[model samples]
Target: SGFRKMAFPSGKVEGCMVQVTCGTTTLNGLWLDDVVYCPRHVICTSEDMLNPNYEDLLIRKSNHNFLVQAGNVQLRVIGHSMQNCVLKLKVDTANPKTPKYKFVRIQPGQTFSVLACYNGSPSGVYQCAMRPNFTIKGSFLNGSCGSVGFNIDYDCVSFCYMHHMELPTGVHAGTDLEGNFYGPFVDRQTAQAAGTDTTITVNVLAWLYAAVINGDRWFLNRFTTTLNDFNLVAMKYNYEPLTQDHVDILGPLSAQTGIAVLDMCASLKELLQNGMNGRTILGSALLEDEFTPFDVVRQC
Candidate 1:
């Protein structure tokens, strides 16, 4: 039999104590608005409150609430009558050198768990329960109530973070026997040098594109200009007009999108050669025209 939540109002009990809340033999009542009275008898034992004889009485035993696991401690209050109960377990009571104790403030129908160390010198515990006030008026843990003789068996070694950690090693074929790996790590300076080459490629691409396109477009866009202005460029180079393939390769280079810096440099060198050949032929044509009588008596 255990302590149970029961109706306790209107009926005057034999002890003249008006029952506010009652269970089994244990009665909780208000004594003239002065203090909360749980057990009338001062010498109340743990077994009297926890293991009451009546089946209907709400006797909350520790076995139902305490779910103890290795390196962990859990406590729960399963009884509604024991709402807002404060339970304190005095661990290793016999050995007072290093007094170990834990407190749990549990509301009815809830549980609380915490990590605890229970190795070395293990000892038993005694319970002193209370609600609201920290008085021993109505608190007792009737003889060997907890499963582990009121003692916790916490394993210290299994729960330490340092004990469970491991270091990383041997990542690749270049890894040494001591587990150090040699890699060509791209540092800040190497990245900056690569970035400069990429920027140079983009600039060269823009320079070459403008050198031919907008300069030619300015004359071509004029109303009086004809294809004759650019006619010598193709005839001298022995090449046709630039197509989509040339523009595709030049587009990535100019935008500096995806292709490597070396590809842009290669495209730039090719266009430079084309410009040199065209400039030589076009300039020779203009100079030769100036040297002739076409300029009307201009000889030096």
Candidate 2:
């Protein structure tokens, strides 16, 4: 069975151990002072906790309150006990005013997904100011038990970046055949002489395709053949590209769940053009190489 009975000994508050199982994987944690402590090692197995497409299942204590720092993943909790427990999910924003911490409380059998924005780097501190979109779904189980039982499922996904960069004065196609298909376009001197408005675009598909080439097929199954389908999914998930103003306010590399690219002269000329008139460009037509085919190139 998936359920594990918990025994609470009399007069013993400290050194209490609890076992939680999700599928074949098991998690052991200490219960002290009415709190269940599941260390990072017990929760996450890999050295890099932000590894993309990573999935794990485990059980957790429900009688006492426990905090799960959901940086950039989908967390689902299923109740398997008689007593009900509260789950509070929180995300810190870049704002300094009140309501800086956006949070919600959910009963068992509910899910929460949040994309955390960091301070300096994605590996740095969490400081999510922008509104993050999430999806929730689950059902509870009724059963008698000494302590509350909860089965938790979590999945890690790759992050996408909404970049805003100024266009160069003029871009001429280059003849490079690596990742740059439309030629390196403009040179450093030409890009340095930028004289136009910035373009907003999201790299959701680009990064996903990069992952596919590296042997990940989770996102590959989501698309059919059209580039518009991919754009639809990106917008559905609120991966819409951001403007220059939002980019400036969020600072550098703020998106913890995805990537972030600010105004960069070197790469901007190679990745963007001035055709869409500030609208979100799906992928760079100039950089469309073997990684991005013509079928995947379209307007957003």
Candidate 3:
């Protein structure tokens, strides 16, 4: 009895029962009632994982995945299992107060791919959240059960590899109203030296215009004269900044072009300056044969 008394000191110490409540709990531990249960959100840890140079291109994960740095990249998500799941994507922009979001459904055995870059802007952070069908409560964390989610992040570098084009031979040399010469060149060297190679210089812009505008008659009719004037100003100044009037003209053209005017102008300037030197230009779209040879450069 004396030994029992030592073990039970002070009448069993009342053996208090502790009740713990939690919003939700994972397999490992209990989440206390006071704290909110947050779902699994994972940020890409390795810079090299997102790098374009490293070509092993599959980003597979279970929970929310955040890819912070992206450029000209294509993301493909594959869905698995019998349950219907939703892949929620949000592009992080400068303004976080109101970011845009896109929702895609991944049926079993299906996949979806999207280009990260859009509207001539560099790609931004991509948030991919895989969730099972939503409940009335709209609980993203709760819906993650019983679903397999896969993410693929790729570096689709925006390299505009220029293709070699043969200058038209034996044509008469002509001059525009601004005295800019067009060649009937004796040879490629002569055409290049004279800076009269429309195939190299003017045609690049023309191709961009065609691809961006895509034959929108309203845009063509509305901005043809203004665009021509803007091009003239660009050439006259050797691709310098435009005057106020031309700047105003460029705004609508940019809107119609579906890319920032400055970006287009910058690409044009880069092409004009470096193209003849055998350096490639930077452009957004895939152009046809009549267009200059350009490919996407993967930016990390």
Which 10 successive residues of model 3 have the least lDDT summed? Answer: 1-10
Which structure among the candidates has the greatest lDDT? 3
Arrange candidates by TM-score, descending: 3, 2, 1
Number of backbone collisions per candidate: 9, 5, 11
* TM-scores for the candidates: 0.13, 0.15, 0.19
Q: Score candidate 3 by TM-score against the native.
A: 0.19
- TM-score of candidate 1 on Cα atoms, chains taken together: 0.13
Q: Residue by residue across 118-226, what tens digits does model 3's lDDT show?
A: 2212122211211111101111222122111112323111111000112223212211111122232221123322232222223234344544554322112222234
What candidate 3 gets wrong by more than 4 Å, as runs, is: 1-169, 173-206, 214-250, 270-300
What lDDT tens digits, residue by residue, belong to model 1 across residues 1-300? 111111112111111122221223222221111222222221123444433332233343332332212123221223223211212222211211212222122211111111111221112222211111111111112211111101122311110000000112211111111112112211011121111001112223333333232222111111221233322333343332333443454553344334333333344334334443434221221111111111111110
Candidate 2 local lDDT, 167-248, one digit each (tens): 2322211111111112122212124332221112323233333333334332222212233443343344333444344344
Model 1 spans > 4 angstroms off: 1-199, 217-267, 272-275, 278-300
User: Which is better, 2 or 3, measured by lDDT?
Assistant: 3
lDDT for position 45 in model 3: 29
RMSD of each: 36.3, 23.6, 27.3
